[PDB]
Amino acid sequence: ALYEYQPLQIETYGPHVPELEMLGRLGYLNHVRAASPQDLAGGYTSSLACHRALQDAFSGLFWQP
Amino acid sequence: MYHNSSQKRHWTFSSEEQLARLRADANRKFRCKAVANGDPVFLEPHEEMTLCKYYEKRLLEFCSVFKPAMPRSVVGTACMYFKRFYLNNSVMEYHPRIIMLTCAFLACKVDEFNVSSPQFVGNLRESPLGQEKALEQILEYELLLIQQLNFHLIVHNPYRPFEGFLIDLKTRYPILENPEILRKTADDFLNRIALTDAYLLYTPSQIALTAILSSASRAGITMESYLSESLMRTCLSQLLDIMKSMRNLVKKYEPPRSEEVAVLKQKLERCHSAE
Amino acid sequence: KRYEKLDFLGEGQFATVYKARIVAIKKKDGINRTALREIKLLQELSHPNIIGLLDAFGHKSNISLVFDFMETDLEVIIKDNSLVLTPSHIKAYMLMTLQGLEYLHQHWILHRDLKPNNLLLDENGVLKLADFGLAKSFGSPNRAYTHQVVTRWYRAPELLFGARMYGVGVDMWAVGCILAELLLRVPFLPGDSDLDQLTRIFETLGTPTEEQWPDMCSLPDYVTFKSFPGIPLHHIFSAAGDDLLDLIQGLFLFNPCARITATQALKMKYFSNRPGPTPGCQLPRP
Numbered sequence: 001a002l003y004e005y006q007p008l009q010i011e012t013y014g015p016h017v018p019e020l021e022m023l024g025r026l027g028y029l030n031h032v033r034a035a036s037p038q039d040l041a042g043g044y045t046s047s048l049a050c051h052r053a054l055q056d057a058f059s060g061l062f063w064q065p
Numbered sequence: 066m067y068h069n070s071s072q073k074r075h076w077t078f079s080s081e082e083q084l085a086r087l088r089a090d091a092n093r094k095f096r097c098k099a100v101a102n103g104d105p106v107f108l109e110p111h112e113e114m115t116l117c118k119y120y121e122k123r124l125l126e127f128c129s130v131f132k133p134a135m136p137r138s139v140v141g142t143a144c145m146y147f148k149r150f151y152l153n154n155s156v157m158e159y160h161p162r163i164i165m166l167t168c169a170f171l172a173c174k175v176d177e178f179n180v181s182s183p184q185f186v187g188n189l190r191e192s193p194l195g196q197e198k199a200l201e202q203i204l205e206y207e208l209l210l211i212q213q214l215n216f217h218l219i220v221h222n223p224y225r226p227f228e229g230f231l232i233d234l235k236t237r238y239p240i241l242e243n244p245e246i247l248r249k250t251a252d253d254f255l256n257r258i259a260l261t262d263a264y265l266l267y268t269p270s271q272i273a274l275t276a277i278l279s280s281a282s283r284a285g286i287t288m289e290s291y292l293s294e295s296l297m298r299t300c301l302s303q304l305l306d307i308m309k310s311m312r313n314l315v316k317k318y319e320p321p322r323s324e325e326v327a328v329l330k331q332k333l334e335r336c337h338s339a340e
Numbered sequence: 341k342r343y344e345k346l347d348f349l350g351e352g353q354f355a356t357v358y359k360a361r362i363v364a365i366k367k368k369d370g371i372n373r374t375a376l377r378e379i380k381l382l383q384e385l386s387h388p389n390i391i392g393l394l395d396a397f398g399h400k401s402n403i404s405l406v407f408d409f410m411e412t413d414l415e416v417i418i419k420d421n422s423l424v425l426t427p428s429h430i431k432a433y434m435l436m437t438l439q440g441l442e443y444l445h446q447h448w449i450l451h452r453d454l455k456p457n458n459l460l461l462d463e464n465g466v467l468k469l470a471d472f473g474l475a476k477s478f479g480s481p482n483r484a485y486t487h488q489v490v491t492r493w494y495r496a497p498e499l500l501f502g503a504r505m506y507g508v509g510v511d512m513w514a515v516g517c518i519l520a521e522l523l524l525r526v527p528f529l530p531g532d533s534d535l536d537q538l539t540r541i542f543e544t545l546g547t548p549t550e551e552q553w554p555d556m557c558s559l560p561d562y563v564t565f566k567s568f569p570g571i572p573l574h575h576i577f578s579a580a581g582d583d584l585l586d587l588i589q590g591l592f593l594f595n596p597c598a599r600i601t602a603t604q605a606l607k608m609k610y611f612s613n614r615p616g617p618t619p620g621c622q623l624p625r626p
């Protein structure tokens with residue numbers, strides 16, 4: 001009766017969203033506002049905003065009623 | 066997230082015909098109610114639509130001059146609230162002026178835009194007693210608006226999908242040298258799309274991408290490689306058809322005209338005066 | 341409406357909860373903002389470890405939220421001296437909490453009120469995150485937040501130093517605190533004020549450095565504290581295994597970015613190692 005991690009399977013009906021840690025090396029973070037030292041201290045990074053923006057741009061793009 | 070949202074599940078509709086059906090049902094149920102409660106005073110569904118377009122424009126004006134500065138998300142949420150409310154309600158029952166004010170009032174709360182009732186109603190070009198009466202009416206209609214939305218308050222707007230698409234273009238589509246020059250015109254197109262019923266018929270990502278693509282075409286830039294390659298053929302056909310139908314909805318839009326709007330406003334004031 | 345009030349379940353500064361038919365009803369500014377927040381958030385979320393909003397209804401400026409009826413919460417489990425919290429029980433509570441939190445975080449929502457009495461347990465042993473009255477969306481730069489959120493005993497140090505912008509760490513730290521409370525059967529860091537809370541944090545876990553927390557000095561309410569070495573983790577939790585200690589250390593990392601996410605926590609060996617989390621039907625009841 002062990003446990004095993006299952007990734008969250010949620011259909012987004014759109015293009016694949018790049019993983020958060022990859023964003024910086026894929027060039028995405030060159031086009032979002034850098035997180036200021038206070039924000040980084042609090043735990044907010046530009047990767048969060050960029051990931052949210054991409055997820056919303058791709059969500060349900062292929063879906064139809 | 067939109068892909069499991071209430072907006073996608075319950076408030077995105079199959080066609081303009083379905084929206085016309087819901088609005089005609091609203092107009093007929095108000096007529097049946099009034100007749101059971103007792104004429105050329107009634108407004109027709111197209112007249113209701115003209116009034117709703119005029120009052121969505123009024124709501125946009127109010128949200129525009131609002132202080133403290135209303136975030137664009139609040140304005141979009143309020144306009145979507147107004148559209149959804151008048152999908153299933155006649156302007157002959159609930160007056161669109163008060164409903165639009167209640168839409169802004171509820172959207173400010175839902176978006177987490179912090180305003181108190183006095184500062185909300187101080188934005189109206191009226192009298193302080195008129196402001197107090199307006200606040201009383203808004204408070205009376207707040208729960209009605211919430212009920213008519215079926216308690217679905219989160220509204221997914223096209224602005225953040227627009228920003229995500231701008232980021233994706235700037236990163237992965239070098240053919241487009243500077244995607245930012247597409248924003249302004251695309252923003253304009255976004256506004257036009259918001260005037261139509263598109264917000265009840267297509268996803269916010271589809272609306273945002275349609276605006277960006279229309280801006281690109283208006284700029285003479287071909288962005289078909291972005292769809293084919295960057296977005297990685299049946300699905301491409303459905304997406305292209307959705308975009309073209311949206312552009313046609315924008316093209317077929319008829320803005321309200323002054324004389325017909327004045328006549329319908331007189332008719333509506335008579336409807337609310339009687340009974 | 342369609343519900344008749346059976347029992348009285350409690351009172352708060354916001355609402356009163358009754359047990360009815362089984363469901364629980366929570367009864368010039370207009371409609372209450374906390375109720376609207378709960379409505380707007382719980383309508384967009386659907387997960388077994390998140391409290392379900394079954395219905396809402398009311399009259400005038402009153403409104404009645406309807407939820408599934410929740411038998412107990414983790415606070416009653418912790419304080420019940422007849423109950424023994426085996427490592428399997430703790431693992432299961434932690435697993436349900438983290439799965440609900442993972443779902444919540446993927447939809448860009450922070451709970452910001454995590455604590456044992458906000459983790460409710462039903463008759464089947466399913467833990468649900470509840471009391472979304474302070475929950476907020478995150479990931480949008482144009483929105484600023486208040487640092488007074490999260491009750492003091494479970495408040496993350498970044499919050500205690502006035503972090504306006506934050507992320508999942510504010511929940512994860514609370515989860516860590518909750519884990520600590522599950523292990524010690526007592527609040528980990530029961531500070532009396534913000535100063536006392538920070539002092540307890542640093543005296544137990546060590547005064548963090550410019551290395552462990554690269555930008556701590558930038559927080560608007562940052563206070564330089566005495567350099568407490570910090571009690572070693574295996575000394576605070578004498579019975580914690582190495583995997584459990586790694587989980588605790590990840591949840592209590594002073595750097596909020598470095599602090600483990602719900603996804604990363606779920607991937608740790610502690611949850612996959614023997615013994616497995618106990619099934620909900622076997623979880624203890626007070």
Ligand SMILES: CC(C)c1cnn2c(NCc3ccccc3)cc(NC[C@]3(O)CCNC[C@H]3O)nc12
Nearest residue numbers: 349350357364366407409410411412413457470471
């Ligand atoms: C989803 C909500 C409305 C709900 C569902 N069931 N339920 C119960 N059931 C009985 C019981 C549970 C747990 C411990 C003891 C008794 C009590 C209660 N109390 C109101 C709270 O504010 C809510 C959470 N935070 C602290 C609480 O005081 N809320 C709820």
